[model samples]
Target: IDMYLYDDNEESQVQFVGFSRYDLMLVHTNRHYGKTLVLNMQTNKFGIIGTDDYIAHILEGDEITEYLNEVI
Candidate 1:
């Protein structure tokens, strides 16, 4: 599932299972609480806004599962 945080003052967290061809993008508060755990893939990038941050990571691929078996 895709997750989005519209409020910037609350704390939140997320977790997910591995997917082969899908990825998740999260926009969350920078001061309150925000982090991401990507599982299994290759070629990932991150972009942080003034109050919002975004992560583009591969979750699964041919020979990898990006972050499926690891902790971020």
Candidate 2:
């Protein structure tokens, strides 16, 4: 997935990228897009404010569980 990183200007920069089951945490609610599980992990492997790269786009409830099961 390509992520858009913005500093101040409207111009955006793309960081081409692409996380795990263990050493990971499923968090609910966020300051930005709530219910995304704000998908984050340990050792800073990957942190997603959004779920564009996740298996489940919604990233909530049972949907979030799918990601863990798949990764595990």
Candidate 3:
């Protein structure tokens, strides 16, 4: 499934699995959130993406906090 998120006048496609452990970053914005740092467990790489960046290819999808975490 592809996750399309929007806030702070920003839109991003979450590329990796949401349940996995990975490094994350916090940005300064209205809808403050963490952008991916890198998922070393999945891939050894690092790239800082701004608010608007493309991710994930076409895929079918029939689709946060402690409870909210599940929402992401």
Candidate 4:
């Protein structure tokens, strides 16, 4: 995947490039969208992602649904 940084000016154009590439955590309801959660094993820190941009513009389930899209 190419470098994808979140730019506030990008607005709704932001897209989640990689979430499942890490230790993927299927999370609970997140206001909406397919669930995605992550954590740091050493720091105990947590991260979240979702399918709905309106609610949480990050990794969408469909984006990572495919198992390493041969092309991916």
Per-residue alpha-carbon lDDT of candidate 3 for residues 42-72, written as tens digits (9 for 90 to 100): 4443444333442222111112123223323
Candidate 4: 10-residue stretch with minimal lDDT: 9-18
Q: What TM-score would each prediction reach against the true structure? A: 0.23, 0.27, 0.24, 0.26
TM-score order of candidates, top first: 2, 4, 3, 1
Candidate 1: regions farther than 4 A off: 1-10, 15-20, 25-27, 30-41, 49-72
On a 0 to 1 TM-score scale, where does candidate 3 land against the true structure? 0.24
Ranking by lDDT: 2, 1, 4, 3
Q: Which of the two, 1 or 4, has more lDDT?
A: 1
- The 0-to-1 C-alpha lDDT of every candidate, in the order given, reads 0.38, 0.40, 0.34, 0.37
- Number of the top lDDT candidate: 2
Q: In model 3, what is the error at residue 13, expressed in angstroms?
A: 22
Q: Give the TM-score of candidate 4.
A: 0.26
Q: List the residue pairs that clash in candidate 4.
A: none
lDDT of 4 at 4: 75
TM-score of 1: 0.23
- In candidate 3, position 45 carries an lDDT of 39
For residue 34, model 3's alpha carbon misses the true position, in angstroms, by 9.4
Candidate 1 per-residue C-alpha lDDT over 1-72 given as tens digits, one digit per residue, 9 for 90 to 100: 498758545564544434435554444455534444333223454333222222233222433323422433
- Model 2, residue 4: C-alpha shift (Å): 27
lDDT of 4 at 14: 21
